Structure 1
Amino acid sequence: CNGVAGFNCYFPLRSYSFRPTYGVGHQPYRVVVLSFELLHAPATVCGP
């Protein structure tokens, strides 16, 4: 594709274009993921 768009040359990005007029199951969701590690270690982080 020599670095130009065309047939079978699609940019692997797509936009969202969020608007307040969409349906309930369409607005973006802010997501976080917390991962722990249950092993034998100095155990730096501990709860209250």
Structure 2
Amino acid sequence: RSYGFRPTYGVGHQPYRVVVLSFELLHAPATVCGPKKSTNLVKNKCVNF
């Protein structure tokens, strides 16, 4: 069935753009990552890795 996308219609049938993100969570090599900066590893010292 088609839609009556009339610009004069009220909020009763005002269309919106919609995006669905299905994040993939599993134990696998990671490709996409957030915006952080790497540092230097520290050996033989208690660190919050």
Q: Into which bin does the TM-score normalised by the smaller protein fall? A: 0.5 to 0.7
Identity of aligned residues (%): 97
Distance of 1:25 and 1:41 partners within structure 2: 45
- Structure with larger Rg: 2
List 4+ stretches of structure 1 deviating above 3 A. Answer: none
* Structure 2 spans left out of the alignment, 5+ residues: 36-49
Aligned to 2:24: 37
Please, what TM-score do these two structures have when normalized by structure 2? 0.61
